[PDB]
Amino acid sequence: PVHFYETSYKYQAADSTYMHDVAINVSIKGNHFTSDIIIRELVKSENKNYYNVIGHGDIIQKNTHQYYLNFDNIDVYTGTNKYKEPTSISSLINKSNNIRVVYLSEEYVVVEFFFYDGQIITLHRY
Amino acid sequence: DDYPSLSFQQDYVYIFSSDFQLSEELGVALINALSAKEIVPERLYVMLNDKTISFSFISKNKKSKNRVLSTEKKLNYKHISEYIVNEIEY
């Protein structure tokens, strides 16, 4: 059984005008997952750069409310013409990335995950 | 696991943080502010770390609003509360 998750958020640097607009989309078919992330960077309220990041791997449930992801593929697309990264690509393809659930529902789920070395967020189900 | 354990639960407010003092001060401020502006969240999650601050505001319509804030030096209950309340009300 496949469960889809989706959410968006905005990151803001308190010492700068820099910020992210991030849309998250996850697909879980059982033991494996596929994540799709779009990061639009804005400096001074102007669409600066973008990133499309696609993930794939295993989601392993340790406890009833404690998971972790093991990526086997990470794919980054960006603007050809050439900042804060939510997570480093190397830290994903080497470590297990913990996800602790704090509330489960049929319409949404609330988790604490690994972006920015600590982030809480709500994801809608479908 | 290493995420901060829960540290404050009111009507709709949840706060995960290793600073129980800042959690208390922040929760009451949110309750006060949102009631003053007559805003009733279905639920409001918040997470405090050394650098980052994040929260999730679940609306009565079950549509959420998520935010993150990184800061050089730590902020207090009023600064965080004004930030969170400002993002919610938009």
Residue numbers in the entry:
A (entry chain B): 31 to 112, 118 to 161
B (entry chain A): 164 to 253
Please give sentences taken from the publication describing this entry.
In V. parahaemolyticus, the activation of T3SS2 by bile salts is regulated by two transmembrane ToxR-like transcription factors, VtrA (VPA1332) and VtrB (VPA1348). Furthermore, we demonstrate that the periplasmic domains of the transmembrane proteins, VtrA and VtrC, form a functional complex that binds bile salts to activate VtrA’s cytoplasmic DNA binding domain, which in turn induces T3SS2 via the downstream transcription factor VtrB. The structure of VtrA/VtrC periplasmic domains reveals an obligate heterodimer where VtrC recruits structural elements from VtrA to complete a β-barrel with a hydrophobic inner chamber that binds bile salts. Our biochemical data and the structural analysis demonstrated that the periplasmic domains of the inner membrane proteins VtrA and VtrC form a stable complex that functions as a receptor for bile salts.
To further understand the nature of the interaction between the periplasmic domains of VtrA and VtrC, we crystallized the complex and obtained its X-ray structure. The structure was solved by multiple-wavelength anomalous dispersion phasing using anomalous signals from selenomethionine and refined to a resolution of 2.70 Å using native data from an isomorphous crystal. The asymmetric unit contains one complex with one copy each of the VtrC and VtrA periplasmic domains. The VtrA and VtrC subunits in the heterodimer make extensive interactions with each other, with an interface area of 1,149 Å2. The VtrC subunit consists of eight β-strands and a short α-helix. The eight β-strands of VtrC form a β-sheet meander that folds into itself to form a β-barrel with a small space between the first and last β-strands (Aβ and Iβ). The β-barrel is lined on the inside by hydrophobic side chains and is covered on one side by the short α-helix (Fα) and an adjacent disordered loop, which could not be modeled in its entirety due to the poor electron density of this region. The Hβ-Iβ loop is particularly rich in aromatic side-chains, promoting us to hypothesize that this loop could be involved in binding the steroid ring structure of bile acids. VtrA Fβ intercalates between VtrC Aβ and Iβ, making numerous polar contacts with VtrC Aβ and closing the gap in the VtrC β-barrel. The incorporation of structural elements from VtrA into the β-barrel fold suggests that VtrC may not fold properly in isolation and is consistent with our inability to purify the VtrC periplasmic domain in the absence of VtrA.
